[PDB]
Design an enzyme around this catalytic site. Structure first.
Site, PDB file in Angstrom:
ATOM      1  N   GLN A 148      47.303 -68.123 -46.760  1.00 25.99           N
ATOM      2  CA  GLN A 148      48.946 -68.804 -46.659  1.00 25.99           C
ATOM      3  C   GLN A 148      50.075 -68.152 -46.858  1.00 25.99           C
ATOM      4  O   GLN A 148      49.737 -67.930 -48.582  1.00 25.99           O
ATOM      5  CB  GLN A 148      49.060 -70.246 -47.003  1.00 25.99           C
ATOM      6  CG  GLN A 148      49.108 -70.479 -48.518  1.00 25.99           C
ATOM      7  CD  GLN A 148      49.114 -72.424 -49.440  1.00 25.99           C
ATOM      8  OE1 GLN A 148      48.095 -71.850 -49.730  1.00 25.99           O
ATOM      9  NE2 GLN A 148      49.442 -72.950 -48.420  1.00 25.99           N
ATOM     10  N   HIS A 177      44.497 -70.427 -49.747  1.00 25.59           N
ATOM     11  CA  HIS A 177      44.741 -71.583 -48.838  1.00 25.59           C
ATOM     12  C   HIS A 177      43.283 -72.529 -48.885  1.00 25.59           C
ATOM     13  O   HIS A 177      42.974 -73.427 -48.941  1.00 25.59           O
ATOM     14  CB  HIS A 177      45.166 -71.977 -48.129  1.00 25.59           C
ATOM     15  CG  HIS A 177      45.248 -73.389 -47.392  1.00 25.59           C
ATOM     16  ND1 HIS A 177      46.320 -74.423 -47.482  1.00 25.59           N
ATOM     17  CD2 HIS A 177      44.218 -73.786 -46.177  1.00 25.59           C
ATOM     18  CE1 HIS A 177      45.471 -74.845 -47.084  1.00 25.59           C
ATOM     19  NE2 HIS A 177      44.948 -74.985 -45.921  1.00 25.59           N
ATOM     20  N   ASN A 232      48.808 -74.126 -56.205  1.00 24.33           N
ATOM     21  CA  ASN A 232      49.272 -75.200 -55.508  1.00 24.33           C
ATOM     22  C   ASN A 232      50.882 -74.644 -55.408  1.00 24.33           C
ATOM     23  O   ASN A 232      51.518 -74.868 -56.313  1.00 24.33           O
ATOM     24  CB  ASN A 232      49.082 -76.567 -55.989  1.00 24.33           C
ATOM     25  CG  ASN A 232      49.946 -77.544 -55.307  1.00 24.33           C
ATOM     26  OD1 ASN A 232      50.381 -78.054 -54.244  1.00 24.33           O
ATOM     27  ND2 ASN A 232      49.552 -78.754 -55.958  1.00 24.33           N
ATOM     28  N   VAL A 233      51.482 -74.242 -54.261  1.00 24.68           N
ATOM     29  CA  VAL A 233      52.822 -73.857 -54.032  1.00 24.68           C
ATOM     30  C   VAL A 233      53.284 -75.199 -53.959  1.00 24.68           C
ATOM     31  O   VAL A 233      54.532 -74.605 -54.357  1.00 24.68           O
ATOM     32  CB  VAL A 233      52.479 -72.922 -52.874  1.00 24.68           C
ATOM     33  CG1 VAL A 233      52.032 -72.131 -52.851  1.00 24.68           C
ATOM     34  CG2 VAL A 233      52.494 -74.350 -51.630  1.00 24.68           C
ATOM     35  N   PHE A 271      44.692 -80.824 -57.709  1.00 22.11           N
ATOM     36  CA  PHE A 271      44.583 -79.935 -56.531  1.00 22.11           C
ATOM     37  C   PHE A 271      43.085 -79.072 -56.185  1.00 22.11           C
ATOM     38  O   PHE A 271      42.339 -78.684 -55.224  1.00 22.11           O
ATOM     39  CB  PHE A 271      45.762 -78.934 -56.479  1.00 22.11           C
ATOM     40  CG  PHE A 271      45.547 -77.804 -55.289  1.00 22.11           C
ATOM     41  CD1 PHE A 271      45.597 -78.389 -53.460  1.00 22.11           C
ATOM     42  CD2 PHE A 271      45.413 -76.116 -55.556  1.00 22.11           C
ATOM     43  CE1 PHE A 271      46.288 -76.902 -52.671  1.00 22.11           C
ATOM     44  CE2 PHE A 271      45.379 -75.656 -54.742  1.00 22.11           C
ATOM     45  CZ  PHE A 271      46.457 -75.462 -53.813  1.00 22.11           C
ATOM     46  N   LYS A 274      39.680 -81.293 -56.290  1.00 20.14           N
ATOM     47  CA  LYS A 274      39.063 -81.413 -54.735  1.00 20.14           C
ATOM     48  C   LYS A 274      39.122 -80.517 -53.694  1.00 20.14           C
ATOM     49  O   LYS A 274      38.168 -81.121 -52.325  1.00 20.14           O
ATOM     50  CB  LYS A 274      40.860 -81.924 -53.559  1.00 20.14           C
ATOM     51  CG  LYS A 274      41.080 -83.172 -54.610  1.00 20.14           C
ATOM     52  CD  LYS A 274      42.368 -84.146 -54.450  1.00 20.14           C
ATOM     53  CE  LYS A 274      43.876 -84.502 -54.843  1.00 20.14           C
ATOM     54  NZ  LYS A 274      45.184 -83.433 -55.323  1.00 20.14           N
ATOM     55  N   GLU A 275      39.685 -79.027 -53.805  1.00 25.36           N
ATOM     56  CA  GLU A 275      39.038 -78.158 -53.119  1.00 25.36           C
ATOM     57  C   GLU A 275      37.438 -77.833 -53.357  1.00 25.36           C
ATOM     58  O   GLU A 275      36.557 -77.758 -52.477  1.00 25.36           O
ATOM     59  CB  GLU A 275      39.828 -76.487 -53.570  1.00 25.36           C
ATOM     60  CG  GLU A 275      41.125 -76.428 -52.897  1.00 25.36           C
ATOM     61  CD  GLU A 275      41.930 -77.066 -51.752  1.00 25.36           C
ATOM     62  OE1 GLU A 275      40.379 -77.093 -50.596  1.00 25.36           O
ATOM     63  OE2 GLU A 275      42.850 -78.139 -51.624  1.00 25.36           O
ATOM     64  N   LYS A 294      35.990 -81.084 -51.580  1.00 24.55           N
ATOM     65  CA  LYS A 294      36.193 -81.553 -50.714  1.00 24.55           C
ATOM     66  C   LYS A 294      35.229 -80.034 -48.994  1.00 24.55           C
ATOM     67  O   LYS A 294      33.814 -80.566 -48.296  1.00 24.55           O
ATOM     68  CB  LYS A 294      36.649 -81.430 -49.905  1.00 24.55           C
ATOM     69  CG  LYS A 294      37.401 -81.026 -47.994  1.00 24.55           C
ATOM     70  CD  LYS A 294      38.952 -81.332 -48.147  1.00 24.55           C
ATOM     71  CE  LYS A 294      38.794 -82.285 -46.431  1.00 24.55           C
ATOM     72  NZ  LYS A 294      40.116 -81.783 -45.497  1.00 24.55           N
ATOM     73  N   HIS A 295      35.363 -79.276 -50.308  1.00 25.09           N
ATOM     74  CA  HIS A 295      34.835 -77.208 -49.230  1.00 25.09           C
ATOM     75  C   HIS A 295      33.938 -77.132 -49.796  1.00 25.09           C
ATOM     76  O   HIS A 295      32.981 -76.688 -49.842  1.00 25.09           O
ATOM     77  CB  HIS A 295      36.191 -76.936 -49.301  1.00 25.09           C
ATOM     78  CG  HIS A 295      37.127 -77.220 -48.090  1.00 25.09           C
ATOM     79  ND1 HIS A 295      36.679 -77.887 -46.795  1.00 25.09           N
ATOM     80  CD2 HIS A 295      38.307 -77.471 -48.190  1.00 25.09           C
ATOM     81  CE1 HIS A 295      37.628 -78.296 -45.935  1.00 25.09           C
ATOM     82  NE2 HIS A 295      38.550 -78.430 -47.200  1.00 25.09           N
TER      83      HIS A 295
END
Ligand SMILES: *[C@@H]1O[C@H](CO)[C@@H](O[C@@H]2O[C@H](CO)[C@@H](O[C@@H]3O[C@H](CO)[C@@H](O)[C@H](O[C@H]4O[C@H](CO)[C@@H](O)[C@H](O)[C@@H]4O)[C@@H]3O[C@@H]3OC[C@@H](O)[C@H](O)[C@H]3O)[C@H](O)[C@H]2NC(C)=O)[C@H](O)[C@H]1NC(C)=O
EC number: 4.6.1.19
Length: 200
Positions: free
Chosen positions: A9, A33, A70-71, A80, A83-84, A87-88
């Site tokens: 991003q 991102h 985390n921009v 942050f 969670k990445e 979740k992924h």
């Protein structure tokens, strides 16, 4: 999962994207991102059952502060990143072994394998100068740094200005060879990048 999406991003544009203010000043750089284990047909996997629980070291976090901030608020970086992973990252076993390996794998792609999108664009003479560009020139630049494979692009419209916001490089199940990204955005979508006048 079937393949990976590695999405970067452009911070300047992300911080111009919505009602959420970036509390920290963005750089004119593409940073990470996401790295998403993805499916060719239907929804991608999410929140897969974990196989291990690991603690991140400060040195890993220091690299992620630079490559995957985390921009919106750097003080929220730890939750942050957690969670990445949950979740992924958790969905990429065994190619992705554990939380630390997930983040080390992203750093390996961005730095060692030269997948920093700011660098790929710069090698094609495209700097973050705020110029209006043709979509094909951005696409040609990325394909020249990614084994001829087609990236997935995300743009946003602000008034009369459409700007480039995300570029995704897709790879095979092992993450060792690029593949064309399936599922580009349709033209009706406000995330679609038009053929001309994209600002970067
Ligand atoms: C993701 O990729 C981007 C794009 O490649 C990286 O950002 C770019 O990083 C380079 C530094 O590696 C940066 O260039 C420097 O810019 C500053 C400020 O303008 C200059 O003062 C620097 O010049 C000095 O240092 C170089 C040695 O590196 C020396 O040769 C010069 O004479 C002088 O002492 C340097 O400018 C570069 O100078 C060399 C020349 O060949 C380059 O054309 C010129 O840029 C870029 O500004 C920066 N680009 C952007 C768009 O911000 C980014 O770091 C990378 N991310 C990570 C984590 O690796």
């Amino acid at each position: 999962y079937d393949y990976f999406q590695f999405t970067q991003q452009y911070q300047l544009a992300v911080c111009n994207s919505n009602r959420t203010l970036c509390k920290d000043p963005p750089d004119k750089l593409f940073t990470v991102h996401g790295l998403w284990p993805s499916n060719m047909v239907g929804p991608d996997p999410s929140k897969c059952p974990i196989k291990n629980i690991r603690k991140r070291e400060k040195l890993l976090e220091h690299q992620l502060e630079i490559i995957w901030p985390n921009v919106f608020d750097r003080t929220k970086n730890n939750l942050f990143w957690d969670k990445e992973w949950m979740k992924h990252g958790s969905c990429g076993y065994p190619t992705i072994d554990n939380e630390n390996h997930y983040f080390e794998t992203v750093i390996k792609m961005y730095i060692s394998k030269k997948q920093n999108v700011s660098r790929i664009l710069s090698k094609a003479k495209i700097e973050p100068d705020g110029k209006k560009r043709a979509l094909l020139d951005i696409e040609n630049a990325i394909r020249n740094g990614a084994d001829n494979k087609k990236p997935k692009l995300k743009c946003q419209k602000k008034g009369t200005t459409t700007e480039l916001v995300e570029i995704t490089l897709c790879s095979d199940k092992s993450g060792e060879h690029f593949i064309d990204c399936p599922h580009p955005f349709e033209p009706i979508s406000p995330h679609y990048c038009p053929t001309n006048n994209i600002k970067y």
